[PDB]
Amino acid sequence: PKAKIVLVGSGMIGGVMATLIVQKNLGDVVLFDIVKNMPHGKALDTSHTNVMAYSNCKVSGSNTYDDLAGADVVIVTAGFTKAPGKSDKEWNRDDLLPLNNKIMIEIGGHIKKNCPNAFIIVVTNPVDVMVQLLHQHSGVPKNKIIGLGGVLDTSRLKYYISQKLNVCPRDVNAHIVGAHGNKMVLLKRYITVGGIPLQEFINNKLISDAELEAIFDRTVNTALEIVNLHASPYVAPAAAIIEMAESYLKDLKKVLICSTLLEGQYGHSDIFGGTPVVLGANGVEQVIELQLNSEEKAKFDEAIAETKRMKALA
Amino acid sequence: PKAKIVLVGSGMIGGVMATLIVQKNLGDVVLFDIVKNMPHGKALDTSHTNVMAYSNCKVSGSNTYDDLAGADVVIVTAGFTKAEWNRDDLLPLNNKIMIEIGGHIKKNCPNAFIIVVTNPVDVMVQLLHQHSGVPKNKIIGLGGVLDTSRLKYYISQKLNVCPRDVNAHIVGAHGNKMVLLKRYITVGGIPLQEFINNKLISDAELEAIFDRTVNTALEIVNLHASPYVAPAAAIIEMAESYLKDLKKVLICSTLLEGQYGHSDIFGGTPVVLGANGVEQVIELQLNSEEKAKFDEAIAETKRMKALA
Amino acid sequence: PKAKIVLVGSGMIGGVMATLIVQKNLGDVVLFDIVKNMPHGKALDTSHTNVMAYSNCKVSGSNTYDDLAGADVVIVTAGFTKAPDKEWNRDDLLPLNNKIMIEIGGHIKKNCPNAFIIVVTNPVDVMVQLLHQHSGVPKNKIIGLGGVLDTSRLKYYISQKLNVCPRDVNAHIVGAHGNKMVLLKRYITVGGIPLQEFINNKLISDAELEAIFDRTVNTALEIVNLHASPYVAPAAAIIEMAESYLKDLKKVLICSTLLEGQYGHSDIFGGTPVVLGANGVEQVIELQLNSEEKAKFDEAIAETKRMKALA
Amino acid sequence: APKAKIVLVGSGMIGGVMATLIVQKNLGDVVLFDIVKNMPHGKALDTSHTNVMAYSNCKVSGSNTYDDLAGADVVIVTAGFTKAPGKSDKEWNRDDLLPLNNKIMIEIGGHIKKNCPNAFIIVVTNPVDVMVQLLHQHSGVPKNKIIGLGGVLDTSRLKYYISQKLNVCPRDVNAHIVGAHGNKMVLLKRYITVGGIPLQEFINNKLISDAELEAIFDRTVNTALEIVNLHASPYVAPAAAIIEMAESYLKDLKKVLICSTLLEGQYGHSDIFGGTPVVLGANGVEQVIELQLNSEEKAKFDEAIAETKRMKALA
DNA sequence: CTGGGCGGTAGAACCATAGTGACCCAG
DNA sequence: CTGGGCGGTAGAACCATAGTGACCCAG
C-alpha cells in the first residue's frame, strides 16, 4: 500500500507540504490540527490538485491523533511561536519551552500507540530541543527521528552564493551544522561550487571574503529579513522538509544535513545536533562527522551548549 | 531568454503560483502587488526553493507596473473581494484596477499572454482585453479547468479511478451559473452512462456531486479556509500548455465570436492552448436544454458587465 | 525496500525499460536473459544514468531464474520471433514459446508467486494465458501488453490531424493485440468530446479516420519495413502499466486480461480496459458493445483460440 | 516555435536513446538524421508514439538530408566511423579513422554554416577532443557555442562506482575528470567529494581505501571496454549525459558540467580543446572554469593535450 | 486606572496582504 | 594463395542478443 504521511500542524508550512506531496505523488496525506474545520478546508482544496498533477493521493483533514494509525512518516510543525495571547504580558522566547514540551509529550504518546514504526521529522522550534523531547516521549529508534535544520539553512547559503557566481543554485554545496537558529555553524572551509572549493573563486576574485561574510550574515538572519518585509518563511521550509521525507520514502540515500542524536560525534553525547547524515529506507543510515578544526569545534560547542541551556528549561 | 512570468497580485494564490513555477522550472517570476514590501518577502522565501528543486528561476518582488517590461505571461489575481451589502458594488472598483493594469500592458508587454482570475472572471477578462488592447487569442480567464477539476475529482473518488482519467466539461461562466454538462462526462474515455447502467454510480449520487462542484468555493470558505491551491495549479496548467506549446484542450473563458450564438462577450468553452495562445475554440454541439443553461450563464455575465 | 523489477529478456525492449525505470526512479531492475554476459553489460551501461537522473536504482544483469527471488513485478519479453528460409509458418513458434512460459512459470512458482506479471511475448493474448496457467498466479496479477501500445498509435495519429496534445485523444482497441484488434470508432474522444463532433465540423473526414485505422493495424509492419523494429513505444507502454501498479495510480488502461463471461467469453484472455493499482487488476471494465462491434470481438477471440490450440 | 528543434546527426544507438529521452522530457522537436536510408524514419516513427505515454508534444522525424538542419537550435553529432569500415580494410588502426571522420565534419560544418549558424553544437564522435575542434573549424560557429562530450560521461562512472562503495546517492558524489576523454583522461583524486565533503575524510575514516580508489579509477578509464567485453555496448549513459548538457543549455540552468571546450591559455594551453568544468546556460558556455592544478596534475593534463594534438595533426 | 487570572498550539481589525498586536475585570 | 580495388558513416550469419567479423577477384 501507498505511504501515509501525517502532517501534525496544518498552518502555512503544512499547507505547502500537502501541495508538494500531491505534486510529487508521494503518499496519502492527513492534515492535522487542533484548530477545528480549517484542516478540512485545506485538505479539500488541495485534493483537487490531483487532477492537474496527474496524481492519486488522498488528502484529508483531521482533528484527532487517532489518525496517526498506519502513518509512514509524521511531520511535526505545530507549536507555539510567539506570545499566545494579548494577556501574556512580558514573555520571551524561553517561555515557550514548557508549552511545546507539553505538545511533544502528547504527540509522542500517540506515536507510541499508533505508529511506533513511523519515520518522524520535527520542525517545531527550537528544533534541536524539540526533536530530542519527541524522541524521548515517542520511544522511536534514534535512526527513525530527525530535526529540520541544515537543508533549509544551507539552501539559503547555496542560493545567495549562486547568485554572486552565476551558477545553478544547487551546484553550490555548503555545510551548516550544530544547531538551527542564531548559533548555526557556517563552515566556510566546506563550501564548493560544482565540486570545486570556494577558495579557488575567491582567488580569482570572483567573490571576496567580505562579500562571503556578508552572505553568512544574511543567511543567519534570513527568517528575520523576510518577516521584516511583511511576509513569512514557509515555502522554503516546506520544500526542505519534503526533500528529507522523499529521500526516506524513495530510499535515495541522499546526504542531507539534519538535527540527529549524537552518540559522541564532535565529542558530544545524549543531545541532538545538526550534522550531514545519509537518509534512506532505513532512516538515518549514516551519521557523518565532519573533521572540524579547533575554531570550528569551538563554534559547534557553543551551538550545543545553547541547545542544552534550552533543553533544561523545557 | 527564459520566459518572464509576472504575477499581478501576490496573495495566497500568487504565492502558490511562484512555488509551482519554480518546481517545474518554468520561467523567471515577478511577484507584484500594491501592498508594499510583502511581495519582496515572499519572493525571497520562494527563491530559496530553487535549490531543493534543482531549478534556476529568478523570483522577484515588485511594487511598480514597470516590471511588466518584457513579460511573456501575465497573470492577474489582484482585486477587491470582501465587504447585507451587494457583491455587485465591487465591479466598478475592479474595473478601475483593470484600466490601470490594461494601460500598463499597452506600454510594456503588448505581446504577453494574459490570464485573468479576478472574479467575476468572465467580466474581468473582457474588461482587461478591452483596456489592454491585446489580441483576442492572447487573453483568457480561468474558469473550467478549476471547476472541472472538482467534478473530475469527486467522480473519480466514487468510481475508484485515477482522478485525471475522468474527463468532464463545465461551460458558460465560472461561478453560480456554470453549466455542468452530464452528457460530456467520460471515465477512461468511456461515457459515464455506461457506469450508471452498471450501477457503479447512480443518477442521484451524480446530482449530489454536481451541487457539490457548484458550491465548492463556498464549502471551503465555510470550513474556515479559502481556495487557492487548486486555482493556482489550474492556472499554471494553462500557462504551461502555452509556454511549452503542448496544445492541450482546456476549458477557459475566451471571446465568443458567434459560437453558441453569442458575440462581444467572454465565456467558458474548451480551447486549444499553445504557442500562439488560443489556437482553436471548440464549440460543443449542445442540445436545446444545455443551450438554455449556456444562455443564462451569458446573460449573467452581461448583467454584471453592464454595471462595470 | 524499493520495488524489485525482473525483466525476463534483455533485448532492446528490455533496454528501454531499464532506462525509463531508472529515469523514473521506479525500482531496482534485473536484466535477465539466456544469452551470456550481454545483460551484465547493459546493466552496467544503464546503472550509470542514476547519476544524470538523480536516482538510486540498482541495475544487475543475470543468467539465472534464481534472480526472480523477491520480485515485485516481472515483465516477460523473451522468446523466439524469427524464422529458421523464406515463406514459412509463424504458428510454428507457438509450441516453442510455450516451453519458455512453462519454464518461467515453473520458476515464478518457486521464486515470486506474489509478483505482478506483465507478458509481452507475441501472440500476447495466448502467451499470457499460457503463463498464467504454468505460473499459477491469481488472475488479477497477470496481464498482457496490448491496447496501451495499439491505442497510443491511434491517439497519436488523430492528434496530428487535429493539432492537439497526443494524450488529449482517447480511444479503445480491444479483443486481441495484432491483426484482429477491434478499433472502436464510437469510443474515440478528443479532450473529452466525441470525435463525431470534429467529424461533423469537417476537421477530419471518415475516410481520413479509416486510413488512420489501417495504419494503426499496420504500424509494426510499417516500422519493420522502414528497417527498424518497434521497441521504444512498447517499452514505454509497459512502463505505464508497471508504474500504475507500483504507484497505485488506478489508471484505466487497456490490457490483455482473463475473461470470465464478459463479451460472452470465458477461459480466454483478451483486450479490455482495466483499472490497474496496488491490487493488480482492480476492475475489468466491460465495454457495452453493439452486436456489430461484438462480432469483431468474437473474431479476435476465435483467432486467439485457434492459436492457443497450436501451442 | 520555440519549441526548440534538436537535430541528431547520427541516428545509431545513442541517437535512439537521445530521441526517447528528449520526448520523455518534452525538450523539443527531434530530427533523427542519418545517411542510412529509411532506418531514421522507422526509429522516429516508433519514438513519436511515446508522446502519448509521456504526456509530451514533440515532433519526431527521420531525415536523410542535411537540409533538415534548417532552424535547428541544437545539433548533436554522433555520426562517424568507429571501426574498420569493411572487411576489405585490412590492418586498420584507430588513427586511420581520423581522416574519414574529418571529412564527415567538413561536410556537417559546411551545412551548419549554411542552415543554422546560431545553433548550439555538441559533438560526440571519437576521439571527441579532436572532432569537436574540427567541427568548430569547419562550421565557423563561436567557441562558446560548441562543446564535446567528455567529462559528464566519464565522471558519471566514477561518481557511480564510488557511491556504491560508500552507499550514498550516486549524484551526491562529485568528481572531476579533465584533459581529454579516453585513455589519457585525468582523474583528479584531490577534487572528489561526497555530499560536499572531501573524499579524504572517508578515506581517513577507512570507509574506502586509497587502493580501492585507484582500482575504481582503472575501471572508470576502462568502462567502455569492460561493457563491450560483456557482449554489449555503451550507449545509454552517453545519451543520458548528452541530454544533461543539452538541457542545461535549453533551460539556462547554468549547471557546471565537464565538457570538451576551447582552451585559450587555461592550463598553459591554446588553440586546442580539452575537458574542463564549464558553465552552460542560454548563452552556451558562459564560463570556463580553470581548476587550480598542482604541478603533477598539470603534467597529466599535458599528456592528455599532447595526445589530442598528435591525433589532430593526423586529421 | 492597574494587576493578574484566565486560557491560550487565542482573542481585533487593519483591508487589493498579512504581520502586528490581538482580554477581561475587579477593586 | 597473396594482393589490393573499390567502396565503405559496408558487406554474413550466428540466432531467445548483438559484437564479431563482415568482399571479391585476378591471376
Tab-separated table of N, CA, C and O in Angstrom, chain D residues 240-315:
chain	number	residue	atom	x	y	z
D	240	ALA	N	22.274	9.666	-22.135
D	240	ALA	CA	21.877	10.453	-20.932
D	240	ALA	C	22.725	11.715	-20.652
D	240	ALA	O	22.160	12.759	-20.276
D	241	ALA	N	24.070	11.627	-20.821
D	241	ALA	CA	24.949	12.727	-20.414
D	241	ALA	C	24.805	13.880	-21.361
D	241	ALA	O	24.826	15.064	-20.965
D	242	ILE	N	24.678	13.512	-22.636
D	242	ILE	CA	24.441	14.457	-23.693
D	242	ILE	C	23.169	15.247	-23.466
D	242	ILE	O	23.149	16.486	-23.633
D	243	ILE	N	22.110	14.540	-23.082
D	243	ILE	CA	20.829	15.214	-22.848
D	243	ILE	C	20.922	16.167	-21.633
D	243	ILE	O	20.397	17.312	-21.658
D	244	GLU	N	21.653	15.717	-20.606
D	244	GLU	CA	22.006	16.584	-19.493
D	244	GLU	C	22.647	17.918	-19.962
D	244	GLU	O	22.194	18.985	-19.604
D	245	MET	N	23.646	17.843	-20.819
D	245	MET	CA	24.273	19.065	-21.340
D	245	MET	C	23.300	19.898	-22.102
D	245	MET	O	23.181	21.103	-21.842
D	246	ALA	N	22.635	19.286	-23.089
D	246	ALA	CA	21.602	19.976	-23.856
D	246	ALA	C	20.537	20.688	-23.069
D	246	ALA	O	20.109	21.838	-23.382
D	247	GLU	N	20.072	19.997	-22.044
D	247	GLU	CA	19.065	20.565	-21.194
D	247	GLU	C	19.473	21.844	-20.454
D	247	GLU	O	18.664	22.770	-20.330
D	248	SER	N	20.747	21.898	-20.010
D	248	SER	CA	21.263	22.996	-19.238
D	248	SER	C	21.321	24.190	-20.098
D	248	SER	O	21.110	25.299	-19.643
D	249	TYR	N	21.656	23.966	-21.377
D	249	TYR	CA	21.541	24.960	-22.420
D	249	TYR	C	20.094	25.380	-22.676
D	249	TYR	O	19.761	26.630	-22.616
D	250	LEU	N	19.240	24.453	-23.039
D	250	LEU	CA	17.866	24.880	-23.457
D	250	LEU	C	17.014	25.528	-22.371
D	250	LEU	O	15.979	26.073	-22.648
D	251	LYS	N	17.468	25.457	-21.127
D	251	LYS	CA	16.701	25.983	-19.996
D	251	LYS	C	17.446	26.980	-19.153
D	251	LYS	O	16.923	27.414	-18.088
D	252	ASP	N	18.677	27.265	-19.589
D	252	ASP	CA	19.546	28.219	-18.912
D	252	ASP	C	19.590	27.800	-17.448
D	252	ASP	O	19.313	28.554	-16.549
D	253	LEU	N	19.941	26.546	-17.231
D	253	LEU	CA	20.105	26.012	-15.903
D	253	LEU	C	21.452	26.498	-15.272
D	253	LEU	O	21.568	26.601	-14.054
D	254	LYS	N	22.447	26.808	-16.107
D	254	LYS	CA	23.817	27.202	-15.643
D	254	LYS	C	24.480	26.233	-14.761
D	254	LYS	O	25.200	26.624	-13.806
D	255	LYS	N	24.271	24.951	-15.074
D	255	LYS	CA	24.988	23.885	-14.470
D	255	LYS	C	26.480	23.885	-14.815
D	255	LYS	O	26.882	24.257	-15.946
D	256	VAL	N	27.296	23.530	-13.825
D	256	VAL	CA	28.698	23.308	-14.026
D	256	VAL	C	28.818	21.837	-14.504
D	256	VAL	O	28.408	20.857	-13.796
D	257	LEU	N	29.347	21.683	-15.716
D	257	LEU	CA	29.452	20.372	-16.352
D	257	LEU	C	30.841	20.257	-16.940
D	257	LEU	O	31.388	21.241	-17.427
D	258	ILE	N	31.449	19.078	-16.891
D	258	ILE	CA	32.727	18.962	-17.569
D	258	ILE	C	32.541	18.559	-19.042
D	258	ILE	O	32.157	17.395	-19.321
D	259	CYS	N	32.896	19.515	-19.943
D	259	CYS	CA	32.807	19.377	-21.410
D	259	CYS	C	34.161	19.530	-22.057
D	259	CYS	O	35.048	20.102	-21.474
D	260	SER	N	34.308	19.005	-23.255
D	260	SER	CA	35.449	19.341	-24.043
D	260	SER	C	35.260	20.758	-24.644
D	260	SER	O	34.358	20.956	-25.455
D	261	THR	N	36.043	21.743	-24.216
D	261	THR	CA	35.871	23.144	-24.665
D	261	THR	C	37.182	23.783	-25.207
D	261	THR	O	38.309	23.218	-25.003
D	262	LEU	N	37.068	24.958	-25.871
D	262	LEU	CA	38.283	25.589	-26.441
D	262	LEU	C	39.155	26.228	-25.358
D	262	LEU	O	38.729	27.140	-24.679
D	263	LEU	N	40.391	25.802	-25.238
D	263	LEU	CA	41.286	26.393	-24.244
D	263	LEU	C	41.959	27.640	-24.819
D	263	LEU	O	42.493	27.604	-25.926
D	264	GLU	N	41.887	28.758	-24.106
D	264	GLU	CA	42.641	29.920	-24.541
D	264	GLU	C	43.632	30.404	-23.446
D	264	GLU	O	43.475	31.498	-22.896
D	265	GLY	N	44.632	29.602	-23.114
D	265	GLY	CA	45.511	29.990	-22.025
D	265	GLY	C	45.350	29.123	-20.772
D	265	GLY	O	46.351	28.888	-20.084
D	266	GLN	N	44.138	28.647	-20.456
D	266	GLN	CA	43.953	27.826	-19.270
D	266	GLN	C	44.807	26.572	-19.347
D	266	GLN	O	44.948	25.961	-20.400
D	267	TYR	N	45.380	26.227	-18.203
D	267	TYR	CA	46.316	25.114	-18.009
D	267	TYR	C	47.583	25.224	-18.840
D	267	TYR	O	48.297	24.249	-19.035
D	268	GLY	N	47.839	26.397	-19.367
D	268	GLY	CA	49.027	26.601	-20.181
D	268	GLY	C	48.813	26.171	-21.618
D	268	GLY	O	49.771	25.819	-22.282
D	269	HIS	N	47.569	26.198	-22.108
D	269	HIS	CA	47.262	25.750	-23.472
D	269	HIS	C	46.314	26.596	-24.277
D	269	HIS	O	45.353	27.151	-23.742
D	270	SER	N	46.573	26.657	-25.585
D	270	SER	CA	45.780	27.439	-26.540
D	270	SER	C	45.511	26.679	-27.794
D	270	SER	O	46.195	25.677	-28.021
D	271	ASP	N	44.533	27.164	-28.587
D	271	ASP	CA	44.169	26.598	-29.891
D	271	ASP	C	43.981	25.089	-29.845
D	271	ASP	O	44.358	24.364	-30.738
D	272	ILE	N	43.387	24.601	-28.780
D	272	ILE	CA	43.125	23.179	-28.661
D	272	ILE	C	41.901	23.093	-27.766
D	272	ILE	O	41.567	24.043	-27.049
D	273	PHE	N	41.168	22.004	-27.878
D	273	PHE	CA	40.046	21.752	-26.965
D	273	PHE	C	40.500	20.708	-25.963
D	273	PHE	O	41.356	19.842	-26.254
D	274	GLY	N	39.872	20.757	-24.798
D	274	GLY	CA	40.132	19.826	-23.746
D	274	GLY	C	39.056	19.938	-22.671
D	274	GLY	O	38.327	20.968	-22.578
D	275	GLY	N	38.934	18.852	-21.911
D	275	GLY	CA	37.942	18.757	-20.810
D	275	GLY	C	38.227	19.652	-19.632
D	275	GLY	O	39.352	19.633	-19.048
D	276	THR	N	37.224	20.430	-19.266
D	276	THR	CA	37.332	21.262	-18.094
D	276	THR	C	35.896	21.601	-17.649
D	276	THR	O	34.956	21.569	-18.483
D	277	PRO	N	35.681	21.891	-16.351
D	277	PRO	CA	34.343	22.276	-15.971
D	277	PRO	C	33.925	23.575	-16.642
D	277	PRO	O	34.740	24.483	-16.750
D	278	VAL	N	32.681	23.660	-17.144
D	278	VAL	CA	32.246	24.926	-17.750
D	278	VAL	C	30.863	25.236	-17.189
D	278	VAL	O	30.226	24.324	-16.625
D	279	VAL	N	30.450	26.505	-17.261
D	279	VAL	CA	29.075	26.823	-17.026
D	279	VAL	C	28.236	26.893	-18.328
D	279	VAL	O	28.567	27.641	-19.262
D	280	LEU	N	27.172	26.119	-18.391
D	280	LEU	CA	26.299	26.047	-19.605
D	280	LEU	C	24.918	26.594	-19.372
D	280	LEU	O	24.125	25.967	-18.636
D	281	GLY	N	24.630	27.749	-19.976
D	281	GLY	CA	23.281	28.294	-19.928
D	281	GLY	C	22.770	28.633	-21.322
D	281	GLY	O	23.237	28.061	-22.311
D	282	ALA	N	21.817	29.577	-21.359
D	282	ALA	CA	21.272	30.183	-22.566
D	282	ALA	C	22.333	30.719	-23.512
D	282	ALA	O	22.101	30.697	-24.722
D	283	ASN	N	23.465	31.230	-23.000
D	283	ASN	CA	24.476	31.776	-23.919
D	283	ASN	C	25.521	30.761	-24.300
D	283	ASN	O	26.591	31.162	-24.739
D	284	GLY	N	25.249	29.473	-24.096
D	284	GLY	CA	26.226	28.397	-24.393
D	284	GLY	C	27.162	28.284	-23.214
D	284	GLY	O	26.680	28.285	-22.102
D	285	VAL	N	28.477	28.111	-23.434
D	285	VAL	CA	29.480	28.154	-22.373
D	285	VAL	C	29.591	29.594	-21.879
D	285	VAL	O	30.092	30.499	-22.615
D	286	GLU	N	29.039	29.821	-20.687
D	286	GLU	CA	29.006	31.140	-20.110
D	286	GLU	C	30.258	31.378	-19.316
D	286	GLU	O	30.676	32.509	-19.203
D	287	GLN	N	30.904	30.321	-18.841
D	287	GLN	CA	32.159	30.446	-18.083
D	287	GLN	C	32.937	29.181	-18.349
D	287	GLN	O	32.368	28.072	-18.425
D	288	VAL	N	34.244	29.352	-18.426
D	288	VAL	CA	35.167	28.259	-18.484
D	288	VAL	C	35.915	28.347	-17.183
D	288	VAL	O	36.517	29.348	-16.897
D	289	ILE	N	35.817	27.285	-16.372
D	289	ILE	CA	36.418	27.270	-15.070
D	289	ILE	C	37.732	26.523	-15.107
D	289	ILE	O	37.778	25.322	-15.405
D	290	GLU	N	38.798	27.234	-14.773
D	290	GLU	CA	40.143	26.644	-14.772
D	290	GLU	C	40.440	26.061	-13.402
D	290	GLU	O	40.506	26.807	-12.449
D	291	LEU	N	40.595	24.751	-13.281
D	291	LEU	CA	40.918	24.202	-11.972
D	291	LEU	C	42.374	24.571	-11.553
D	291	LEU	O	43.263	24.546	-12.394
D	292	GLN	N	42.614	24.902	-10.284
D	292	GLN	CA	43.970	25.364	-9.853
D	292	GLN	C	44.860	24.177	-9.607
D	292	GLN	O	45.123	23.863	-8.467
D	293	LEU	N	45.288	23.503	-10.687
D	293	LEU	CA	46.034	22.206	-10.595
D	293	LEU	C	47.434	22.375	-10.012
D	293	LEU	O	48.024	23.450	-10.110
D	294	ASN	N	47.958	21.319	-9.412
D	294	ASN	CA	49.304	21.368	-8.894
D	294	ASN	C	50.160	20.795	-9.999
D	294	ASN	O	49.613	20.341	-11.023
D	295	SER	N	51.479	20.825	-9.835
D	295	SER	CA	52.327	20.563	-10.973
D	295	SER	C	52.302	19.095	-11.443
D	295	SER	O	52.480	18.859	-12.625
D	296	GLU	N	52.047	18.110	-10.579
D	296	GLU	CA	51.914	16.730	-11.105
D	296	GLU	C	50.554	16.507	-11.812
D	296	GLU	O	50.458	15.742	-12.782
D	297	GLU	N	49.515	17.199	-11.341
D	297	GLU	CA	48.235	17.080	-12.007
D	297	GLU	C	48.420	17.696	-13.395
D	297	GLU	O	47.954	17.138	-14.380
D	298	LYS	N	49.121	18.826	-13.472
D	298	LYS	CA	49.270	19.544	-14.738
D	298	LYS	C	50.103	18.753	-15.751
D	298	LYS	O	49.749	18.693	-16.930
D	299	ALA	N	51.163	18.094	-15.294
D	299	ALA	CA	51.891	17.156	-16.160
D	299	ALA	C	50.960	16.088	-16.737
D	299	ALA	O	51.139	15.625	-17.854
D	300	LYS	N	49.957	15.702	-15.977
D	300	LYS	CA	48.966	14.767	-16.500
D	300	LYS	C	48.048	15.381	-17.590
D	300	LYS	O	47.789	14.794	-18.625
D	301	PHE	N	47.612	16.604	-17.357
D	301	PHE	CA	46.806	17.347	-18.291
D	301	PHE	C	47.602	17.502	-19.568
D	301	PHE	O	47.059	17.322	-20.690
D	302	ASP	N	48.885	17.815	-19.395
D	302	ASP	CA	49.820	17.944	-20.507
D	302	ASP	C	49.975	16.662	-21.338
D	302	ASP	O	50.084	16.712	-22.554
D	303	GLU	N	49.950	15.501	-20.720
D	303	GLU	CA	49.924	14.309	-21.548
D	303	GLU	C	48.604	14.150	-22.298
D	303	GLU	O	48.592	13.585	-23.382
D	304	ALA	N	47.487	14.661	-21.740
D	304	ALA	CA	46.217	14.495	-22.418
D	304	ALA	C	46.174	15.390	-23.636
D	304	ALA	O	45.898	14.907	-24.757
D	305	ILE	N	46.470	16.678	-23.445
D	305	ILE	CA	46.536	17.630	-24.571
D	305	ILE	C	47.499	17.189	-25.706
D	305	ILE	O	47.134	17.211	-26.892
D	306	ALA	N	48.710	16.761	-25.337
D	306	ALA	CA	49.675	16.206	-26.285
D	306	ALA	C	49.061	15.146	-27.201
D	306	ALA	O	49.193	15.262	-28.433
D	307	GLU	N	48.438	14.130	-26.610
D	307	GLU	CA	47.764	13.082	-27.384
D	307	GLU	C	46.694	13.638	-28.350
D	307	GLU	O	46.644	13.241	-29.517
D	308	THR	N	45.865	14.563	-27.866
D	308	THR	CA	44.862	15.208	-28.706
D	308	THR	C	45.542	15.855	-29.921
D	308	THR	O	45.034	15.744	-31.057
D	309	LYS	N	46.659	16.530	-29.648
D	309	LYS	CA	47.464	17.231	-30.660
D	309	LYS	C	48.030	16.263	-31.694
D	309	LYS	O	48.059	16.582	-32.896
D	310	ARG	N	48.439	15.080	-31.224
D	310	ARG	CA	49.067	14.080	-32.080
D	310	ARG	C	48.027	13.625	-33.067
D	310	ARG	O	48.280	13.584	-34.272
D	311	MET	N	46.839	13.319	-32.581
D	311	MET	CA	45.788	12.898	-33.466
D	311	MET	C	45.269	14.011	-34.345
D	311	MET	O	44.987	13.757	-35.497
D	312	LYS	N	45.100	15.222	-33.819
D	312	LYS	CA	44.700	16.357	-34.639
D	312	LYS	C	45.600	16.492	-35.834
D	312	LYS	O	45.120	16.651	-36.932
D	313	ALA	N	46.902	16.412	-35.634
D	313	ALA	CA	47.834	16.546	-36.745
D	313	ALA	C	47.503	15.513	-37.819
D	313	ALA	O	47.806	15.733	-38.984
D	314	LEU	N	46.894	14.384	-37.446
D	314	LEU	CA	46.654	13.316	-38.437
D	314	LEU	C	45.328	13.425	-39.190
D	314	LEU	O	45.065	12.645	-40.103
D	315	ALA	N	44.489	14.383	-38.828
D	315	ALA	CA	43.196	14.521	-39.493
D	315	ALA	C	43.331	15.250	-40.847
D	315	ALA	O	42.477	15.166	-41.738
